[PDB]
Design a protein around this ligand. Structure first.
Ligand SMILES: Cc1cc2nc3c(=O)[nH]c(=O)nc-3n(C[C@H](O)[C@H](O)[C@H](O)COP(=O)(O)OP(=O)(O)OC[C@H]3O[C@@H](n4cnc5c(N)ncnc54)[C@H](O)[C@@H]3O)c2cc1C
Length: 257
């Protein structure tokens, strides 16, 4: 079995459909910030594995995962009961398309996400390299309800306080959460706010162009088609394949089964 066995260090529930947890990390597991790996539990003879983006920076000696809670699992129906000390299986080799290396040089990096698609971006915003490569980093997190804005305080209060890169955060990181169904100051779907050009007006940056702007997209399969349509409109060109650099990168946060 080519699977590492990690133990849960802590868990935290945001609401009844979201929760995060931290585990130990075997030093053989190396990854690029933004990549995903497979995690799972042993259930009735076979390990039940699922793809999960790593929500922690690669320089830390522990892992963190941001998870959804689906009525029927079979994984999250069980995973939601994770307790400190519980064991988890993690694969050996990470993979994925959301890495800064496949991004042609630019000055602004837009991270477009919805729901749990925020996960890979949590490791990216704590990567001193993205701050070294870009002038501004815009983290957009689209959601349905206010209680779904996980990591709010962390991004807003704690990150700017960092002793190692807090200055870069305050100076380069623009957090722009949008809520769809409830009263919120950034009302609507991120796709509509970007297409109309309002988003840029709100954040003080000029409209997107294929020379200064790069992006990464992680959300529902439908949100992706809609986001590509919006970015292609500004003239950006998607990377043709994993390993080939382009103006923007996309990856599904989950699949429609
Ligand atoms: C590259 C990649 C990265 C992924 N990263 C993550 C991640 O960081 N966190 C994560 O929770 N999941 C992630 N997923 C998908 C996720 O792993 C699976 O949906 C989940 O493990 C399925 O567990 P389950 O057995 O309970 O659900 P399923 O077998 O998926 O069945 C539940 C159903 O719920 C819906 N659903 C599933 N996952 C989600 C979700 N996250 N948000 C909203 N609706 C959903 C789908 O319609 C799905 O068929 C990723 C998938 C891929 C391909």
């Amino acid at each position: 079995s080519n699977l590492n066995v990690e133990r849960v260090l802590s868990v935290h529930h945001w609401n009844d459909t979201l929760f995060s947890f931290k585990t130990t990390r075997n030093p053989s597991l190396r990854f690029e910030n933004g990549q995903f790996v497979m995690i799972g539990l042993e259930v009735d003879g076979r390990p039940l594995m699922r793809a999960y983006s790593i929500a922690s920076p690669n320089y830390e000696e522990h892992l963190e995962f941001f998870s959804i809670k689906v009525q029927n699992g079979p994984l999250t129906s069980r995973l939601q009961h994770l307790k400190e000390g519980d064991e988890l299986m993690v694969s050996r080799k990470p993979t994925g398309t959301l890495v800064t290396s496949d991004l042609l040089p630019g000055k602004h990096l837009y991270m477009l996400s919805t729901g749990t698609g925020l996960a890979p971006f949590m490791s990216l915003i704590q990567d001193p390299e993205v701050y070294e490569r870009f002038e501004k980093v815009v983290l957009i997190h689209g959601v349905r309800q206010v209680n779904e804005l996980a990591y709010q305080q962390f991004i807003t209060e704690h990150l700017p306080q960092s002793e190692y890169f807090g200055e870069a955060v305050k100076e380069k990181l623009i957090y722009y959460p949008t809520v769809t169904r409830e009263s919120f100051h950034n009302q609507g779907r991120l796709t509509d706010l970007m297409r109309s050009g309002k988003l840029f007006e709100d954040i003080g940056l000029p409209p997107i162009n294929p020379q200064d702007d790069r992006a990464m997209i992680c959300g529902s399969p439908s949100m992706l088609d809609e986001s590509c349509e919006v970015l292609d409109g500004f003239g950006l060109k998607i990377s043709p394949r994993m390993g080939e650099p382009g103006d923007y990168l996309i990856e599904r946060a989950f699949v429609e089964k």
